[PDB]
Write a protein that binds this ligand. Sequence first.
Ligand code: HEM
Length: 366
Amino acid sequence: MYDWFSEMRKKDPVYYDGNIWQVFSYRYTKEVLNNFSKFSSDLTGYHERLEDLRNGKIRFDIPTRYTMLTSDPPLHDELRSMSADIFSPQKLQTLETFIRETTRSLLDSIDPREDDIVKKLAVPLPIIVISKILGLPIEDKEKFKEWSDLVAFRLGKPGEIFELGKKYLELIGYVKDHLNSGTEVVSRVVNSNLSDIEKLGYIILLLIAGNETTTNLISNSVIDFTRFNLWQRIREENLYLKAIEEALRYSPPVMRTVRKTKERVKLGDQTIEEGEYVRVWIASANRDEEVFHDGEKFIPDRNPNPHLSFGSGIHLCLGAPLARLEARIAIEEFSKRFRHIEILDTEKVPNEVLNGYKRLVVRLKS
Ligand code: HEM
């Protein structure tokens, strides 16, 4: 649907189709994302229940409705400041050896003749890394794999209520079980003025917000580098940093995000009424010809590359530096292991927001 995106960017960058508003151009998607006053992220009733949560009036509820992702400032900033430096440059420098050793370990498990790199590399890496950072027992990776499906970007589908109930029951129980054995990261959260439900929500967000997305970055990168035959060049010219950024732009793990109008507002030539949902197409903005010359092409050394794959504004992905580091080390170590790669079989996740692969079977020549 990238051709439909281009047509919309040209004729209706801000389009109303009866029920929701949709934005396709780079200029307007960025404007929406940055104007948090007009375009709110308070879509889960968080602000409305903050008083009763902090009072202990609400005792039970789905914890994932109360995270920094579904909040506007000042609440949003009060929450985010508790972990603003979790992925600081110094912290990541120190994690480099652990991340590199971990992917080398995962690569060691790959059978060159024919293996699934999503299963052996892309899925485990982010999970193992976040577990170390949070101080949660890696010995529960498989469970973590299951719970990663709960990431907020994923919308509902019929017949999942029982399955989801099971995961929530286990996940919540696990977090409550390890709230006081985590790193300073979780300690600061557990020792704040937040209600119990919010603490749960906060820890779950940090635990699952980047698993499927980071996995998708690695998978999408492997697919793009292979299909456009760039492995040789990337190693040769050391285009890892720029190439991964071009994968993020071209094959964004998250296709779009949503906002709700906080009052009548004019975006472009349109006046969006108060209380309307606005779908922001990150994938389309990333192809905007005005901002990305030859945007329909995968240019490995494209520079600069101001894509919106991690968002923009106050909710700009907290894990961006980590995701970038993990993916880079993954792709570097992988490239150093094979002389030729061949994609034998793939299976794509069936979702309109999360963009990635469920299976990626390849054959490698070490
Ligand atoms: C390549 C992988 C990733 C992609 C493409 C991705 C994408 C995003 C996007 C689009 C947003 C903004 C959502 C919005 O504006 O409504 C976001 C927010 C967030 N992401 Fe990521 N993410 C990735 C990896 C990670 C990782 C590794 C973590 C670490 C736990 C993480 C933690 C978060 C958090 C906590 C937020 C909310 C921040 C806030 O609301 O201020 N993400 N992510």
